[PDB]
Amino acid sequence: HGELQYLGQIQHILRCGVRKDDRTGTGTLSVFGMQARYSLRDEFPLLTTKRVFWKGVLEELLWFIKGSTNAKELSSKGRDFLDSLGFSTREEGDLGPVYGFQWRHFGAEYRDMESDYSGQGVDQLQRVIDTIKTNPDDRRIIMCAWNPRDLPLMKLPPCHALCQFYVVNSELSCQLYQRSGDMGLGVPFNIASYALLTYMIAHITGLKPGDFIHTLGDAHIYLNHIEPLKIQLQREPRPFPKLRILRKVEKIDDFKAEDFQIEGYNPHPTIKMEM
Amino acid sequence: HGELQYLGQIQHILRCGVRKDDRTGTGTLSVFGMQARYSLRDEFPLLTTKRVFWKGVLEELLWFIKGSTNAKELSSKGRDFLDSLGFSTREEGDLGPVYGFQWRHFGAEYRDMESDYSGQGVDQLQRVIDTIKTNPDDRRIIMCAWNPRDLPLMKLPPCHALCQFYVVNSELSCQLYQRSGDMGLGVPFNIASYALLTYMIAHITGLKPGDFIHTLGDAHIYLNHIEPLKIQLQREPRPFPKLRILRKVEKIDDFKAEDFQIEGYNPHPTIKMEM
């Protein structure tokens, strides 16, 4: 049961992690370098040791897929990067280059959130889907995401996340490298989010989902999540649910919140952890 | 004994890897997603189950550090990317943007191999060393390398390797993500190479080496290395050697082949594996 990997990693950080401050001076327990493998075959790794907000993971992911930079466009599932924006454009909800923009218009000059960027920049997501169809053996089927606060801070900043796909025997697998991971909040969300992305891409390429591998650099627990995570560790996982796609879909841009159904999801209660 | 991780990974690919072709149609056994942790504390992970050519790992690394793109500059430790070069510049040994150039002049327009690029492009390596000194908690202490055949092939190609450093309690750790790894030839070399880079950076920043984490996407064994790797698996590792830096050095550019001594290196015999 692969949620055991996640819980194993929480325990290891609690026993062996060392104190390390994050950019805001808030404290964490930290271990550098970890990896977990979650099977996507006839199951979907929505964590069961607490209720994960799946409807919002879906909706944030559809928003990324659209290429939006408009905060208002986010549905019910709605830091320092805002400081580098002008006033009036910021009050509109124009967030600047975010995950959508980077995924769909990588390297284009970002103007305003309602501009037409059709055919501007590299479409990383479409490039991934194309390479799977044209050469499934390719070792470069890679899409990267940047923390948006980094973009105004330096020339050629490194990505936050590197996502690599892989195809053999009709199965699509995905590895996410994250240079840092908040184990209490971000990680469970990210697992579901990239597992879902993988389900989508597999669906439109005629493949079956394989594995989801999650690799971290700075894997950390915030000090104020220690006690709830200690309680989460006492809970026993329950078989993962299944994810079902409800109609045949052909292009990544056509999926809709309503195309997806989770089933057999029996999680333990919500754990409220706050940032 | 961490060489056991490497051997564990060879065995797993042999038992569970599946057939997958590489760009040239040559066959491999492949597993997607693996990770190994090698301690750098009072030891240096030069593999012992075969003699690894350390003097050449050193010398190739000094060459990268210099920023060279001149094949002739390589010392005694001397593919399709050559096809996109002009004739006469290619016969000079002008290789184009390679690992040095990418590390020291990331994003600069590459002219010829003898040009002055002082202060052109981003110096990834110097940026790493600077960030360690100015903010050792930073989660962005990252340097990327590109397979040079990719640079003429597409806009904004993904890296081949993402190298992330990490500092806590006076220890410098390093994680290398490689989107593919040849386990028989490249991997052992890469382990030594990034462990050595880590020793260097630690030396000039007043830190002690911590851990080396090696993460792969497509971890593969070439079909023609199966039999020698099967024999390598029967050999027992011997305590790793120590690496000693022989004088106090202050800038990364000042290290010389002669500053380094390996000791207590008792490897098993050379295994000749051919590409």
From Swiss-Prot, chains A, B:
One of its GO terms (biological process) is methylation. InterPro entries: Thymidate_synth/dCMP_Mease, Thymidate_synth/dCMP_Mease_dom, Thymidate_synth/dCMP_Mease_sf, Thymidylate_synthase, Thymidylate_synthase_AS. It catalyses: dUMP + (6R)-5,10-methylene-5,6,7,8-tetrahydrofolate = 7,8-dihydrofolate + dTMP. Pathway: Pyrimidine metabolism; dTTP biosynthesis. Keywords: Cytoplasm, Disease variant, Dyskeratosis congenita, Isopeptide bond, Membrane, Methyltransferase, Mitochondrion, Mitochondrion inner membrane, Nucleotide biosynthesis, Nucleus, Phosphoprotein, Transferase, Ubl conjugation. There is a cross-link at residues 251, 256, 272 (Glycyl lysine isopeptide (Lys-Gly) (interchain with G-Cter in SUMO2)). The keyword Glycoprotein does not apply. It is found in: Nucleus; Cytoplasm; Mitochondrion; Mitochondrion matrix. (6R)-5,10-methylene-5,6,7,8-tetrahydrofolate binds at residue 182. The active site is at 159 (nucleophile). It is an enzyme of class 2 (transferase). Its main location: nucleus. Its EC number is 2.1.1.45. One of its GO terms (molecular function) is thymidylate synthase activity. Belongs to the thymidylate synthase family. NCBIfam families: PRK01827.1-3, thym_sym. It is linked to Dyskeratosis congenita, digenic: A form of dyskeratosis congenita, a rare multisystem disorder caused by defective telomere maintenance. It is characterized by progressive bone marrow failure, and the clinical triad of reticulated skin hyperpigmentation, nail dystrophy, and mucosal leukoplakia. Common but variable features include premature graying, aplastic anemia, low platelets, osteoporosis, pulmonary fibrosis, and liver fibrosis among others. Early mortality is often associated with bone marrow failure, infections, fatal pulmonary complications, or malignancy. Catalyzes the reductive methylation of 2'-deoxyuridine 5'-monophosphate (dUMP) to thymidine 5'-monophosphate (dTMP), using the cosubstrate, 5,10- methylenetetrahydrofolate (CH2H4folate) as a 1-carbon donor and reductant and contributes to the de novo mitochondrial thymidylate biosynthesis pathway. Homodimer. This is Thymidylate synthase. It comes from Homo sapiens. The lineage of its organism: Eukaryota, Metazoa, Chordata, Craniata, Vertebrata. The gene is TYMS.
